[PDB]
Amino acid sequence: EVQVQQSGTVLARPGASVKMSCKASGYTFTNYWMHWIKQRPGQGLEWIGAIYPGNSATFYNHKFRAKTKLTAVTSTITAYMELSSLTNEDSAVYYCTRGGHGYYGDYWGQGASLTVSSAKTTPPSVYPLAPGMVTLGCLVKGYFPEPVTVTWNSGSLSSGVHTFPAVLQSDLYTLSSSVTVPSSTWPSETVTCNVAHPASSTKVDKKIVPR
Amino acid sequence: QAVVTQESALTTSPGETVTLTCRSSTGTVTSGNHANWVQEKPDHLFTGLIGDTNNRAPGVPARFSGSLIGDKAALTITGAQPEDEAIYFCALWCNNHWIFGGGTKLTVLGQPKSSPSVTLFPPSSEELETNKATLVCTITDFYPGVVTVDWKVDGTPVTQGMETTQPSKQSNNKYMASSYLTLTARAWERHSSYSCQVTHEGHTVEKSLSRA
Ligand SMILES: CO[C@H]1O[C@H](CO)[C@@H](O)[C@H](O[C@H]2O[C@H](C)[C@H](O)C[C@H]2O)[C@@H]1O[C@H]1O[C@H](CO)[C@H](O)[C@H](O)[C@H]1O
């Protein structure tokens, strides 16, 4: 039907430049505007600018005029946005959206995450969280880059599991996961969290032991 | 330029009618501001709803309509459905920029409200060996998904050193969030009571521990 296909995740260092792209599917590219939207974590949505491929007209937000360059290749039905001199403030999810008269985005792309960091690949430190039904946790501290996967007892414990979104503390992520089991179950039945950090091929298991 | 203001959160029930507004710091919203409304659902799923003040985007339900009510643009959902629980952003075309409001979180109560289960864990010995101490407060099963978290160390409010995630929708569609208080082990050793205080729908749940 109409589809707006975006490029993948990008990891970039401060000072660099990246090019992101959006391919149109299901409509006449040259009759619609392509807008770009920045969404920061908790800063809301910001409009970067728009390009009209048919005649390559553009509108830019003044704030992004020094940062962005929008282009489109009609034979390839692709729009691009190049961001230069990346700072940490450019880490965000970027969307391209299709616009027309009076509107910027009836159909949206899926987003492309950009992270700008000086950090190096770091494996997680995994710490068991015991109280002393019961809730047990694992803290996965200080890893870069995202993601880590957490399972409990090799996947056997699936019910009552909560893995929370990672926060950034310093330039490394921290995330935790909890499992709630019947109090009779523990410590008789061993509970272990399993953490995998593919980017540094880390796989570590942590048995929760009572305090 | 203009500052576009939206209500931050509204709650309704299935089958009720709810109106969201979008106003500007320049004075009235007019038709040349082409008010747009979009919806954000989990995992960055966005849908255009309304363009050019009142045109429904392709395949948007008829229960969604946009209009100018006085000096404001508004989105009315006549007969709200549980699946309309999401964040709604309006944006205004002003001085050749699309300016976004802050987004309204709309709860459509598709299940009874639920208070948070708060668990606070102390630092593990293995982390205290590194000269660091993180206290973890996990908050699950709350509905509506809006909560505030406050930390107290020996009764004094903590405003430096804590991180709290934004509420994630659980599989059962209640919400979860965690908060972290990180301290050096030296700092941990100077204080005795630590509290994680969570206010949900005007009532506070508090979980405290003592170093000892
Ligand atoms: C270059 O295109 C201008 O004219 C067309 C034809 O009427 C408009 O549809 C364009 O506006 C659309 O695209 C921009 C990028 C926004 O997303 C708003 C959309 O309506 C564009 O006109 C806009 O700008 C003119 C300036 O000439 C006026 O402000 C007009 O009100 C806008 O629609």
Q: How far apart are CA A21 and CA B177, in angstroms?
A: 33
Burial class of B42 by CB neighbour count within 10 A (0 to 12, 13 to 18, 19+) = exposed
Q: How far apart are CA A52 and CA A33, in angstroms?
A: 4
Q: How far apart are CA A27 and CA A44, in angstroms?
A: 29
Asked if A207 and A192 touch (Cβ cutoff 8 Å), the reply is: yes
Q: How far apart are CA A154 and CA B128, in angstroms?
A: 27
Binding site membership of A101 for ligand 1 (Cβ less than 6 Å) = yes
- Best of A122, A164, A171 to disrupt the B interface by mutation (most B CBs within 10 Å)? A164
Q: How far apart are CA B202 and CA A43, in angstroms?
A: 25
Task: Verify that A159 and A87 share a domain, yes or no.
Answer: no
Report the residue of chain A nearest B130, measured CA to CA.
A125
The partner residue sitting opposite A164, judged by closest CB among B55, B165, B182, is B165
Task: Verify that A135 and A201 share a domain, yes or no.
Answer: yes
β-strands A44-52, B148-153 pairing? unpaired
Q: In whole angstroms, how far apart are CA A101 and each of A179, B115, B205? A: 51, 45, 50
Sequential DSSP letters for B98-147:
EEE---EEEEE-SS--B--EEEEEPPPHHHHTTTEEEEEEEEEEEBSS--
Tokens of B62: 């008829």
**Beta-carbon count within 10 A of A167 CB:** 17
Q: Which residues fall within 8 angstroms of residue B77, CB to CB, at 6 or more apart?
A: B12, B17, B18, B20, B63, B64, B84, B106
Task: Verify that A76 and A11 share a domain, yes or no.
Answer: yes
- Kindly compute the dihedral angle of the four CA atoms of residues A197, B126, B179, B189, in this order, to the nearest 10 degrees: -150
Report the residue of chain A nearest B41, measured CA to CA.
A110
Amino acid identity for residue A123 in this structure: P
Within 8 A of B121 by CB-CB distance, chain A residues are: 129-131, 137
Q: How far apart are CA B38 and CA B36, in angstroms?
A: 7
Among A96, A118, A140, where does a domain finish? A118
- Breakpoints of chain B, after residues (C–N > 2.5 Å): none
Task: Verify that A12 and A114 share a domain, yes or no.
Answer: yes
Backbone dihedral region for residue A139 (phi beyond 0: left; psi -120 to 50: alpha; all else: beta): beta
Range of the domain at A84: 1-118
**Beta-carbon count within 10 A of B64 CB:** 19
DSSP A103: B
Task: Verify that A90 and A26 share a domain, yes or no.
Answer: yes
Tokens of B69: 């009510």
Rounded to the nearest angstrom, the minimum Cα separation between B54 and chain A is 10
Element (H, E) at B185: helix B185-189
Tell how many helices (H) and how many strands (E) occur in chain A. Answer: 0, 18
Q: Give me the CATH number covering residue A191.
A: 2.60.40.10
Tokens of A148: 């880590």
Task: State whether residue B172 is helix, strand or coil.
Answer: coil
**Direct distance between the N- and C-terminal alpha carbons of chain B, in angstroms, rounded to an integer:** 55
Binding site membership of B100 for ligand 1 (Cβ less than 6 Å) = no
Task: Verify that A113 and A138 share a domain, yes or no.
Answer: no
Q: How far apart are CA B80 and CA B110, in angstroms?
A: 10
Q: How far apart are CA B93 and CA B99, in angstroms?
A: 6
Decide if A111 and B170 are in contact by the 8 Å CB cutoff.
Answer: no
Task: Verify that A108 and A25 share a domain, yes or no.
Answer: yes
Domains of chain B: 1-110 (2.60.40.10), 111-211 (2.60.40.10)
Structural domain count, chain A:
2
Q: In whole angstroms, how far apart are CA B161 and each of A36, B181, B182? A: 34, 6, 6
Within 8 A of A129 by CB-CB distance, chain B residues are: 121, 124, 136
Within 8 A of A128 by CB-CB distance, chain B residues are: 124, 126
Asked if B23 and B29 touch (Cβ cutoff 8 Å), the reply is: yes
Q: Which residues fall within 8 angstroms of residue B206, CB to CB, at 6 or more apart?
A: B118, B195, B196, B197, B198
Task: Verify that A65 and A19 share a domain, yes or no.
Answer: yes
Q: Which residues fall within 8 angstroms of residue A63, CB to CB, at 6 or more apart?
A: A46
Q: How far apart are CA A59 and CA B102, in angstroms?
A: 22
Within 8 A of B102 by CB-CB distance, chain A residues are: 44
Asked if B131 has any chain A CB less than 8 Å from its own CB, the reply is: no
Q: How far apart are CA B73 and CA B71, in angstroms?
A: 7
Q: In whole angstroms, how far apart are CA A171 and each of A12, A143, A174, B8? A: 13, 9, 10, 30
The partner residue sitting opposite A47, judged by closest CB among B97, B130, B165, is B97
Among A118, A138, A170, where does a domain finish? A118
Task: Verify that A4 and A84 share a domain, yes or no.
Answer: yes
Q: How far apart are CA B21 and CA B31, in angstroms?
A: 15
Task: Verify that A91 and A174 share a domain, yes or no.
Answer: no
Task: Verify that A40 and A112 share a domain, yes or no.
Answer: yes
* Angle at CA of residue A151, ends A146 and A157, nearest 5°: 155
Q: How far apart are CA B37 and CA A103, in angstroms?
A: 9
Q: Which residues pair with A175 in a beta bridge?
A: A140
Task: Verify that A103 and A125 share a domain, yes or no.
Answer: no
* Experimentally determined by: X-ray
The partner residue sitting opposite B136, judged by closest CB among A110, A139, A168, is A139
Report the residue of chain A nearest B170, measured CA to CA.
A162
Q: Whose CA is nearest to atom 26 of ligand 1?
A: B96
Ordered strands of the B193-200 beta sheet = B156-157, B148-153, B193-200, B203-210
Among A70, A100, A118, where does a domain finish? A118
Q: How far apart are CA B188 and CA B132, in angstroms?
A: 8
